[PDB]
Amino acid sequence: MAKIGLFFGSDTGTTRKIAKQIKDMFDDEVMAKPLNVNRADVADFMAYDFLILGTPTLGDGQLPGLSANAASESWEEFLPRIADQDFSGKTIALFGLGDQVTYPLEFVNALFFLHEFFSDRGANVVGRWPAKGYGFEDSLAVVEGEFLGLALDQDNQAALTPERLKGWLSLIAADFGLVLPA
Ligand SMILES: Cc1cc2nc3c(=O)[nH]c(=O)nc-3n(C[C@H](O)[C@H](O)[C@H](O)COP(=O)(O)O)c2cc1C
């Protein structure tokens, strides 16, 4: 019913809180309430033509899920449920949570798997983010000096999250038809 679907994966609530912060900025007409992918219905997920998806990186640079030692199923188990769906015509923006100090070689790698998955199915992906403001040495989520989606780090750069969400949401505002609060 809402224009933008908002889904996330999360083990310790960090990504969930961010998803909520994002929703707090827009009206029910433009964006739906944040929902954990382990609660989502395929038909419910497939209805939106615009999607904002968030995910942390766990285990060993993996998507959250039971194989990554998450307390509950997450993106890992959800993707197969929609692997046969076509995402052509759908606009998707990704945000990832990670810890650049503790995992300098796999910073927000989960973003790559998410991007690859929807990209391989015709989705229009937007929201690349400059990688200069981060300290890391390697990442599957970096292409041409930019992260495949917004990168957030509540472990080391929590103070930067507000300006990053304002700036990033403004970046995908054109594609998504969003209007940021003053
Ligand atoms: C066992 C474990 C592994 C992690 N692996 C990575 C990693 O590979 N890359 C990364 O950027 N962050 C990694 N992190 C950091 C988390 O993604 C980060 O703390 C995030 O904020 C957690 O999100 P959540 O609270 O939504 O689960 C790891 C954290 C833990 C506890």
Author numbering: 1 to 182
What does the paper say about this structure?
Flavodoxins (Flds) are small flavoproteins of 140–180 amino acids that function as electron carriers in a plethora of redox pathways. They carry a non-covalently bound FMN (flavin mononucleotide) molecule as a prosthetic group, which is able to alternate between three redox states: a completely oxidized state (quinone, Q), a one-electron reduced state (semiquinone, SQ·) and a two-electron reduced state (hydroquinone, HQ). Rhodobacter capsulatus is a non-sulphur purple bacterium capable of fixating atmospheric nitrogen when ammonium levels in the medium are limiting. This microorganism possesses a nitrogen-fixation (nif)-dependent flavodoxin (Rc-NifF) of 181 amino acids, which is included within the long chain subfamily of Flds. In R. capsulatus, nitrogenase reduction by NifF has been proposed to be supported by ferredoxin(flavodoxin)-NADP(H) reductase (FPR, EC 1.18.1.2).
Overall, folding of Rc-NifF is conserved with respect to other flavodoxins, consisting of a central parallel five-stranded beta sheet (β1–β5B) flanked by five alpha helices (α1–α5). Rc-NifF displays the highest structural homology with the long-chain flavodoxin from A. vinelandii with an Rmsd value of 0.55 Å Both present an insertion of eight amino acids at the C-terminal of the 50’s loop (NifF insertion) following the β3 strand (residues 65–72), previously observed in other nif flavodoxins. FMN occupies a cavity located at the C-terminal region of the central β-sheet with the isoalloxazine ring stacked between two hydrophobic residues, the Leu58 (β3–α3 loop) and the Tyr103 (β4–α4 loop). However, while long-chain flavodoxins present a Trp at the re face of the isoalloxazine, nif Flds carries a Leu residue (Leu58 in R. capsulatus). The presence of this Leu at the re face makes the isoalloxazine more accessible to the solvent compared to non-nif Flds containing a Trp in this position, which should provide a major stabilization of the HQ. Rc-NifF was crystallized in the oxydized state, but, unexpectedly, the 50’ loop was found adopting a trans O-up conformation, which should favor FMN reduction in Rc-NifF. Rc-NifF presents a basic patch adjacent to the FMN-binding site formed by Arg16, Lys17 and Lys20 (α1 helix), Lys33 (α1–β2 loop) and Arg39 (β2–α2 loop). These residues introduce large differences in the charge distribution on the surface of the protein, which change the orientation of the dipole moment with respect to other Fld structures reported so far. The eight-residue insertion present in Rc-NifF comprises five backbone carbonyl groups (Leu66, Leu67, Ans69, Ala70 and Ala71) and one side-chain carbonyl group (Asn69) protruding to the solvent.
